[PDB]
A paper describes a structure:
Here we describe S55746 (also known as BCL201), a novel, orally active BCL-2 specific inhibitor that has a partially overlapping but distinct BCL-2 hydrophobic groove binding mode compared to ABT-199. Fluorescence polarization (FP) data, using Fluorescent-PUMA as a binder, demonstrates that S55746 is a potent inhibitor of BCL-2 (Ki = 1.3 nM). The selectivity of S55746 for BCL-2 versus BCL-XL ranges from ~70 to 400 folds depending on the assay used. No significant binding to MCL-1 and BFL-1 was observed. S55746 occupies the region typically referred to as S1/2/3 in contrast to the ABT-199 analog, which occupies a greater portion of the protein surface area including S2/3/4/5. S55746 adopts essentially the same binding mode as described in Porter et al. 2009. S55746 forms a single hydrogen bond to the backbone carbonyl of residue A149 buried deep into S2. The size-independent enthalpic efficiency (0.83) for S55746 binding to BCL-2 is suggestive of optimal polar and Van der Waal's interactions, indicative of highly specific binding. Since ABT-199 and S55746 have different binding modes, one can theoretically speculate that mutation(s) in the BCL-2 protein could cause resistance to one compound and not the other. Altogether, these data demonstrate that S55746 kills cancer cells through on-target activity, meaning activation of a BAX/BAK-dependent mitochondrial apoptotic pathway by direct inhibition of the BCL-2 pro-survival protein.
Numbering used by the authors: 7 to 35, 48 to 50, 92 to 203
Write the structure that this text describes.
C-alpha cells in the first residue's frame, strides 16, 4: 500500500506530545497498524538508547532561529550513507524529541515547523526508497 506521509508525521507527533501533557491543536486530526508499529518502533529505539536520549536534551540548545539548521544537520547525518528502516525510525524519534524539547523550552510554535520539515523531507528524499523497498507495509512486516 501507499499512504499519506504527512498524516504519518502528524499522528506520530500529536501522540508523543499529548502523552507529555501538550495538546497540539494545530496538528490535531492498514493505516492503523502502520501508525502503531511506527510508534512502538520509536519507543523501542528510545528504550534501546535511553541514556543517550536523556543526554541529547543538552546537546541541541534549540532556539527559533537555529532550530531548522539543527534539525537539518542531524537528518543529513542520518541519511548520508543511504536509507534503511532503522534510520527512518531514528528520523521519526528525532523529530518527536525535537517537538518535546520545543514545548519544554517554551518554544511550542516550533512544533508546527518541525512537522513541516519532516513531511518535506519524507516527500522529497525518502518516499522513492520507501516505495521501492515495499512501502510502509514492508516496515510493518519487518517490525511487527
Ligand atoms: O547524531 C545522532 C545520530 C543517531 C544515530 C543512530 C541512528 C540509528 C541507530 C543508531 C544511531 C546511533 O548512532 N546512536 C543512537 C543515539 C540515540 C540517541 C542519542 C544519541 C545517539 C547516538 C548513537 C548512540 N551511540 C552509538 C555508538 O555506540 C554507543 C551509543 O540505529 C538505527 O538508526 N546516528 C546519528 C548520527 C549519524 C549516524 C547515526 N543523533 C543526535 C542528534 C542530536 C544530538 C546528538 C545526537 C540522533 C539522531 C536521531 C535520533 O533519533 C536520536 C539521536
Amino acid at each position: 500500500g501507499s499512504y499519506d506521509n504527512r498524516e504519518i508525521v502528524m499522528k506520530y507527533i500529536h501522540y508523543k506530545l499529548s502523552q507529555r501533557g501538550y495538546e497540539w491543536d494545530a496538528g490535531a486530526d492498514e493505516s492503523e497498524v502502520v501508525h502503531k508499529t511506527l510508534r512502538e518502533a520509536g519507543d523501542d529505539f528510545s528504550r534501546r538508547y535511553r541514556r543517550d536520549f536523556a543526554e541529547m536534551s543538552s546537546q541541541l540548545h534549540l532556539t527559533p532561529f537555529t532550530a531548522r539548521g539543527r534539525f537539518a544537520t542531524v537528518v543529513e547525518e542520518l541519511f548520508r550513507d543511504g536509507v534503511n528502516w532503522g534510520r527512518i525510525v531514528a528520523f521519526f524519534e528525532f523529530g518527536g524529541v525535537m517537538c518535546v524539547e520545543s514545548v519544554n523550552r517554551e518554544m511550542s510554535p516550533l512544533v508546527d515547523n518541525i512537522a513541516l520539515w519532516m513531511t518535506e523531507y519524507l516527500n522529497r528524499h525518502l518516499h522513492t526508497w520507501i516505495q521501492d523497498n515495499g512501502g510502509w507495509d514492508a516496515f510493518v512486516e519487518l517490525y511487527g
